[PDB]
Chain A
Amino acid sequence: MFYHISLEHEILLHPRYFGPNLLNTVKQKLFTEVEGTCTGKYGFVIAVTTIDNIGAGVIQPGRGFVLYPVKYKAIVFRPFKGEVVDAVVTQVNKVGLFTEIGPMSCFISRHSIPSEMEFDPNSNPPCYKTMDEDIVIQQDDEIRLKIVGTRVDKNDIFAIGSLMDDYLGLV
Chain B
Amino acid sequence: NEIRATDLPERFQLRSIPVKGAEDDELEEEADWIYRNAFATPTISLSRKGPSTIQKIKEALGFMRNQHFEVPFIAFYRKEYVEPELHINDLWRVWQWDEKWTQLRIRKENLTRLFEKMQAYQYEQISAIRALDTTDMERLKDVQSMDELKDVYNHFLLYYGRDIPKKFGLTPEQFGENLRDSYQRHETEQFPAEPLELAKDTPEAVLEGARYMVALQIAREPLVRQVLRQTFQERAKLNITPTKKGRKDVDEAHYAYSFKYLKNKPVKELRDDQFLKICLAEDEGLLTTDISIDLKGTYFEEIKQFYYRDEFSHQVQEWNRQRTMAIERALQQFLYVQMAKELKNKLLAEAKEYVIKACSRKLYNWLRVAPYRPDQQQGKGIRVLGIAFSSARDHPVFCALVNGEGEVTDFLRLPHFTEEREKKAQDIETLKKFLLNKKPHVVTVAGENRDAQMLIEDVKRIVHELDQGQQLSSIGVELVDNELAILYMNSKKSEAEFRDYPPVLRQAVSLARRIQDPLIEFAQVCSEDILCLKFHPLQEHVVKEELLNALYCEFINRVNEVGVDVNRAIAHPYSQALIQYVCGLGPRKGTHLLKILKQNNTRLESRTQLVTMCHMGPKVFMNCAGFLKIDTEVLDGSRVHPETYEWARKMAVDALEYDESAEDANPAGALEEILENPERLKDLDLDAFAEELERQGYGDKHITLYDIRAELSCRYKDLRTAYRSPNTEEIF
A/B contact in complex, CB under 8 angstroms: yes
Q: In the complex, which residue of chain B has the Cβ closest to the Cβ of A169?
A: B162
Is the beta-carbon distance between A132 and B107 smaller than 8 angstroms? no
Is the beta-carbon distance between A136 and B103 smaller than 8 angstroms? no
State in angstroms the CA–CA spacing of A123 and B17 once bound together: 12
> Looking at B114, B160, B164, which has the most chain A CB atoms within 10 Å of its CB?
B114
A121 to chain B, nearest CB (A): 9
Q: In the complex, which residue of chain A has the Cβ closest to the Cβ of B116?
A: A132
A59 to chain B, nearest CB (A): 44
Is the beta-carbon distance between A133 and B113 smaller than 8 angstroms? yes
Is the beta-carbon distance between A134 and B103 smaller than 8 angstroms? no
Q: Is A135 an interface residue (CB 8 A)?
A: yes
Is the beta-carbon distance between B17 and A132 smaller than 8 angstroms? no
A136 contacts across to B, CB distance below 8 A: 154, 157-158, 162
B158 contacts across to A, CB distance below 8 A: 136
Q: Is A122 an interface residue (CB 8 A)?
A: yes
Question: Of B17, B18, B107, B114, which one neighbours A134 at CB under 8 angstroms?
Answer: B114
Q: Is B511 an interface residue (CB 8 A)?
A: no
Is the beta-carbon distance between A132 and B162 smaller than 8 angstroms? no
A146 to chain B, nearest CB (A): 20
Residue-wise interface mask of A (124-165) relative to B, using a CB-CB cutoff of 8 A (1 in contact, 0 not):
000000001111100000000000000000000000000000
A41 to chain B, nearest CB (A): 36
Is the beta-carbon distance between A123 and B107 smaller than 8 angstroms? yes
Given contacts A122-B103, A170-B162, contact A133 B110 (CB under 8 A): yes
Question: Of A123, A133, A170, which one neighbours B114 at CB under 8 angstroms?
Answer: A133
Q: Is B117 an interface residue (CB 8 A)?
A: yes
B18 contacts across to A, CB distance below 8 A: 122
State in angstroms the CA–CA spacing of A123 and B106 once bound together: 10
A51 to chain B, nearest CB (A): 32
Residue-wise interface mask of B (3-25) relative to A, using a CB-CB cutoff of 8 A (1 in contact, 0 not):
00000000000000110000000
User: Which B residues, 152 to 193, have Cβ-Cβ distances below 8 Å to chain A?
Assistant: 154, 157-158, 160, 162, 164, 166
B160 contacts across to A, CB distance below 8 A: 134
Is the beta-carbon distance between B157 and A134 smaller than 8 angstroms? yes
Is the beta-carbon distance between B114 and A132 smaller than 8 angstroms? yes
| Residue count of chain B within 8 Å CB distance of chain A | 18
B25 to chain A, nearest CB (A): 21
Residue-wise interface mask of B (101-136) relative to A, using a CB-CB cutoff of 8 A (1 in contact, 0 not):
001001100110110011000000000000000000
A134 contacts across to B, CB distance below 8 A: 114, 117-118, 157, 160, 162, 164
Is the beta-carbon distance between A132 and B113 smaller than 8 angstroms? yes
State in angstroms the CA–CA spacing of A132 and B118 once bound together: 9
B123 to chain A, nearest CB (A): 15
A143 to chain B, nearest CB (A): 13
B114 contacts across to A, CB distance below 8 A: 132-134
State in angstroms the CA–CA spacing of A54 and B160 once bound together: 59
State in angstroms the CA–CA spacing of A25 and B103 once bound together: 64
State in angstroms the CA–CA spacing of A134 and B159 once bound together: 10
Residue-wise interface mask of B (575-594) relative to A, using a CB-CB cutoff of 8 A (1 in contact, 0 not):
00000000000000000000
B424 to chain A, nearest CB (A): 64
B118 contacts across to A, CB distance below 8 A: 132, 134
A122 contacts across to B, CB distance below 8 A: 17-18, 103, 106
- 16 more CB-based (< 8 A) A-B contacts, given A122-B103, A122-B106, A134-B118: A122-B17, A122-B18, A123-B107, A132-B117, A132-B118, A132-B166, A133-B110, A133-B114, A133-B157, A134-B114, A134-B117, A134-B157, A134-B162, A134-B164, A135-B162, A136-B154
Q: 28 pairs across A/B with beta carbons < 8 Å? A: A122-B17, A122-B18, A122-B103, A122-B106, A123-B107, A132-B110, A132-B113, A132-B114, A132-B117, A132-B118, A132-B166, A133-B110, A133-B111, A133-B113, A133-B114, A133-B157, A134-B114, A134-B117, A134-B118, A134-B157, A134-B160, A134-B162, A134-B164, A135-B162, A136-B154, A136-B157, A136-B158, A136-B162
| B residues neighboring A (CB under 8 Å) | 17-18, 103, 106-107, 110-111, 113-114, 117-118, 154, 157-158, 160, 162, 164, 166
| A residues neighboring B (CB under 8 Å) | 122-123, 132-136, 170
